[PDB]
Amino acid sequence: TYLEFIQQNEERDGVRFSWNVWPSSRLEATRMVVPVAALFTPLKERPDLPPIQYEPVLCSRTTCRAVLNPLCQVDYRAKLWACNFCYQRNQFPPSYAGISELNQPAELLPQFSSIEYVVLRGPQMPLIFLYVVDTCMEDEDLQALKESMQMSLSLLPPTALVGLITFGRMVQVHELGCEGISKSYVFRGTKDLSAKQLQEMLGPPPSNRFLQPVQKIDMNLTDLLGELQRDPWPVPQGKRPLRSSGVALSIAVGLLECTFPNTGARIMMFIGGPATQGPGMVVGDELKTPIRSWHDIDKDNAKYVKKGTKHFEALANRAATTGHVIDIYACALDQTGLLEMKCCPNLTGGYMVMGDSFNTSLFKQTFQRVFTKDMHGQFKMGFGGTLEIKTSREIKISGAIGPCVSLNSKGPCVSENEIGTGGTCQWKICGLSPTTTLAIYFEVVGRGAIQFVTQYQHSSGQRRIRVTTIARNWADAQTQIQNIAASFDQEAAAILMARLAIYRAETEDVLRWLDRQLIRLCQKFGEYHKDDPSSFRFSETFSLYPQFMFHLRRSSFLQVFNNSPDESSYYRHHFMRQDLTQSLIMIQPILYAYSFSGPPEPVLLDSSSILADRILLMDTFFQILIYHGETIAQENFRHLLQAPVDDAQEILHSRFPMPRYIDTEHGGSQARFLLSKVNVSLQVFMDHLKKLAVSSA
Amino acid sequence: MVLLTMIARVADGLPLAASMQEDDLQQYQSQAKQLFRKLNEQSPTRCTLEAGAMTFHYIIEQGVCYLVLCEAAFPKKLAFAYLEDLHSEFDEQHGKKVPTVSRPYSFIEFDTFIQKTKKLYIDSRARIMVANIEEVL
Amino acid sequence: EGLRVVNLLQERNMLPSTPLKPPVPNLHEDIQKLNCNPELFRCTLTSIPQTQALLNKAKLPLGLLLHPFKDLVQLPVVTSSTIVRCRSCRTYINPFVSFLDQRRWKCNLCYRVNDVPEEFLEPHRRPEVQNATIEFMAPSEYMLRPPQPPVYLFVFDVSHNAVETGYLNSVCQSLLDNLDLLPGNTRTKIGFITFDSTIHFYGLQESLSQPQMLIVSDIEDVFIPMPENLLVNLNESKELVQDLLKTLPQMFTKTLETQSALGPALQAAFKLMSPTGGRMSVFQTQLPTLGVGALKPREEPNHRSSAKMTPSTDFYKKLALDCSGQQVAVDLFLLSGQYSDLASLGCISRYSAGSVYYYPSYHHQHNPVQVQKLQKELQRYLTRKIGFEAVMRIRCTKGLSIHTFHGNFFVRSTDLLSLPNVNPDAGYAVQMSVEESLTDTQLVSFQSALLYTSSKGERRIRVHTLCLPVVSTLNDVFLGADVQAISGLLANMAVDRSMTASLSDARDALVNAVIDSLSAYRSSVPGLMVPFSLRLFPLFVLALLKQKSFQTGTNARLDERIFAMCQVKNQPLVYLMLTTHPSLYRVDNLSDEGALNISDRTIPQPPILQLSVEKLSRDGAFLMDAGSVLMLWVGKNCTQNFLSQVLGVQNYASIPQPMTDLPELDTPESARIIAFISWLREQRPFFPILYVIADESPMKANFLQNMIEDRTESALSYYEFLLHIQQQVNK
Ligand SMILES: [Zn+2]
Ligand SMILES: [Zn+2]
């Protein structure tokens, strides 16, 4: 079963291809409507795979150097194996001398196609956490932020290093635990500083005066964090506080750059408002002028966007080149400037959290999900990931889309047509989780092979290598398009095409390209008589693709207006990282119905699903909404009123960015969210699509 | 939205208490002493003067004047509440010794309460007549 | 008395046994009794020459030496609603005006008649006319701003060398002991800055567990890191500043900072004090080497180098002028063990009415003499009265013109000394000339007025008025000469001659002053004939030439010479004379010819001895009053009674090598010597330490460097000096 094949391959190898049967000819590779693309999750969790504590056993060829995988032909008599990528025949290492047929290594069994190795050679480096704290916020917001940071300090490993940087008008780099004086280095938030300059101005396991181990400093830091008061500078009437977010981040990046380069570090920046001073400014200090909106940026009424975006773009590349992660936790009623700072968490593996106030259950719970541990009490986060992809000689890599940076490595697996962060066989991911999903786009130029090698730093300090080797059948020449049409993953291809549309919208019409490919897909894989719209049908393999495209082109990912620029950057941020299942929920929110006439059942996202005697539970990935009809808007009536609430609580935990909860009913103001995601309309959208699919190609 | 506060006896214009911080002050301090000389027992008890980018605010109680200067953008609603806090404190502590002193600034030590009250109004995160001053001078 | 002529070659013992008293001007009895106290105000020529030609004939300098803020035993404070001042030259109504119509007074400086207002009423019996020294309460127009609060900012060098000297411990202990004794009322503000390669501010808040050390590392672009709690209220935050003064000496014990950024640190300290002004105390221990205002190392001279001074940069001069404009005065405490270019560093205090303090080779363990000296000089520096944002004007009758000022100030408008601070231990000098012949008057007057804000927030005016007669005879000018005052004014002129020209020209002009004046006296009358008023003139000038300010063949170093010149430009006349020509007494045989009037104390009065080794004795002990110190020298063959009954020792060998003071034993010999010592230090507010260390072999016999009458390998004796003058007088 093709569905069982797709399900089992995602659970084992953490990947979902747009096509599971690839074009065996050049004539069909060029004419592919949806490109051969993979939805790859390098750190997907699974039923307790045995960690391999020996060396990976690579191929003995300079260019190839692939990892031993089940696709390799072995010869247990002569103690030799043949590399499946370059046909090179290799000798087994001495630790494999006692190899036998009735006792073979793990990496050769097809069950262990995806597998993780441990490299224990060098002394493990400790984790590094740098707190970058804004102090221009209300007391109740700053006190809650302080309590949240003190709790995160109690979850850190004893070996980890910590630093503290607070800012407002000035920038303070705190020297931790310096006896009874508590000192800090003050810097102007007016001019930017390079790492070298910062190094000259500032100065067994390693530790600086500014980055000390948790087990020896946790008591002084929790007292410092407890005494952190708001920025002492007065804020005059009608003015915004002077906030130097651009310089504070450039000092945090500059600090770690000259102390611990090329090692796992997390710059967690907490923002209570926009940057009003320095490089990286978003808006002026006059309250008379509002923060820029989409209407302001289209009519060229935002003098700080491009100059501010470029500043944080350089900081993003500086930290990504060094190998550090940049987190941004923004909470304010006004906008914050995420549109200008988005490249710091996007290029690295940084998280992006957006709320209304640090003094809410929304931020507090979300912030402690960051430090969620697994079955061994270790953070579900990796550092300094290096993704290298080995392909068959017939495959070339167009590029990747998602949280990663190109290492600019050249080879015969690099394609001329580059897509996204492309033109390379290697990518750096400074931060990855069990969720981080890259979108790899391939191009053909049985059985074709693709190997994913991911080297990252575990939260324990161990260096791990995650090898995943997949194989898909080459098309039969006497049944080319027929087998290709049956191996189509309509869900994965929809998200892989959504990945392309958003990457072009965020780096600029996009909807015109999204329609020409939907019409092209209807003509090549659909059934229809020419000039007869009523004859158009779609296989069960393709039938849901037009609906996934109707919701994608109307979602907030491409219709940026009616949202703030910081909200459009936040929505696109999480979509470019999530796996398949969560990405489908973003584009097409799930909707359950609750009534006396039957148990809860999923219903369509149409206006007809909104009944008066029924309770709805719409699950947008970003918000969970419970809607009550006009009749229910008043023990049996208790089971109905709390059935969606109970189902809400369960999914209101596992999700890392805790979605905003909304309890509304008919006539309520908050019912607007349900009415805009629901429902020109799909009926008209399909009829217009059929008229173009049955007529000219 | 900045600072200049002076407390003077209305009769002879004798200064009683003031407070000034710069890091000009030389011109607006003269105009302040000009007004203290002009004020008499027929002057309006509460008034506001315009001086271009600056704006004076004063009240008069018990023959004592409480003047404050700030930029014109500073709320005139808050300027009078600032002078009211100073008046009630000054009258409660020195209201009966004012008509007897003769030294200039016989209450310099009122500098402390002026500056601690001054900071409770020049910070948004802590929460009558109008005539051009060039006419009265 | 004496109109007689003295032959300096035959006497050779002209120095009196009792202290020198200032001359009495040749004035009428009723006028002299109202004259100003000679300790506050005095003139080099008590008889002013009528013309400039007569002054040039005498070849003596005409000038005034004043100590305007000296501590007084009694001061009349007039609180008049009106200050009676002359309508022309603004001279204050003084005892030497000329009342005629009893309602109109003639100004004694510009001769204009002024109307005596009603408030004044027997107008002449009013205190403003019965006191030459008086303090007024300045009205409203006598101030540019509300009276500023007392602001004290202490700036400490904390480099590796500074930590090794250990000065921070005793200075912080002095502040703790003298916190309540600082001048000021509840408006007093205090701040703290430490520096090395970076400037360190200290915030003090009652809501925080402990102070916060805010470090600005941008050396080329300094700023203030916090707006509120850097200069804190001492009355409210007393507990907070006491912890920091206990915590400061413990922070830098393991410091590797070898460089010091004094320049940028003083800019940070200036920006912090700019809004209010006040007193800035700077403690530097080494050469400034990092940042703006850096100074290059110099090689110290030796006894062989010739007389071949001036600052190397103008940064500390430009910065001092900026401090003066913001009513900020900078007092420099130099505790350096090596050359630190005090010639350039001193400008921070000269052009800001500050005062420099020098403690060479200070060390908390190795140099107990400098430790106790700093402790006592800080006890005075922190508890003496002070005036803020001050100005002073020196006036004189028409015809006399002041043309050169001497002292720590900034001269804004000829006759308008700006005093960011005014301290009671500062001295000032002025040089004048007769621009218009004084044929009209027979009396000329001088008035100094000192506007200042007291530590209690009260604008006050202190006024001194001097009156002198005018003569027209060469002999009358010599009869009124003040040998001490002439010596002080010449020392100030010689310091300027050093910077202006060289040390040789400064020494020559000093010798030529004695030659020209005595040659002029001889040309208007065999041996060296001098009048009675100048019998000590070659003595005090030779002592001037052997002082550490102008000596040559000595092994002196640069910072010692500059600091000695800084004391010439800033000390009152008495302490300048005590430093140059110390008073030498014999103290191993005191007896009952003393001042036993003081109730229960006797207080011997031993005769003053001339500064020659010939006057010493290996059988006795000699105390030398050098003004700021009291060096007690003990002979090798000293008697056994002085050893056990005064020093507490059984033999000369067991006299401890560094002795910080005498013991107070139960012997009448100790009671005599302690009474004489205590009476000496009661004649001054600057407690002088007394070290008996002067043994006959302690390697610290600089007691002999003050024997200015004896010859050395590179200087003439006193008799050799008189022989050289006579050769030049009648050449
Ligand atoms: Zn190979
Ligand atoms: Zn006059």
Author numbering:
A (entry chain A): 3 to 205, 223 to 464, 475 to 537, 541 to 666, 679 to 723, 747 to 764
B (entry chain C): 1 to 23, 29 to 132, 148 to 157
C (entry chain B): 346 to 466, 476 to 662, 666 to 882, 888 to 1093
What's in the article?
Thus, specific recognition of the ΦC motif involves the terminal carboxylate group bonding to Arg750 and Arg752 of Sec24a, with the penultimate hydrophobic residue of the motif nestling against Tyr496, and the terminal hydrophobic residue fitting to a pocket of hydrophobic side chains. A subtle change of the bonding geometry is observed for the Phe-Phe motif of ERGIC-53, in which the larger terminal side chain of phenylalanine is accommodated by a shift of the carboxylate group to bond Arg750 in a bidentate fashion. Difference Fourier maps calculated from X-ray diffraction data show clear evidence for binding of 4-PBA to the B site of Sec24a. 4-PBA closely mimics the terminal phenylalanine side chain and carboxylate group of the Phe-Phe motif of ERGIC-53 (compare Figure 1E and I).
The packaging of cargo transmembrane proteins into COPII-coated vesicles entails a direct interaction between COPII protein and cytoplasmically-oriented ER export signals. About a half dozen export signals have been identified to date, almost all comprising short peptide motifs, all of them binding to the Sec24 subunit of the COPII inner coat. The ΦC export signal was identified in studies of p24-family and ERGIC-53 proteins, and comprises a C-terminal signature of a pair of hydrophobic residues or a single terminal valine residue.
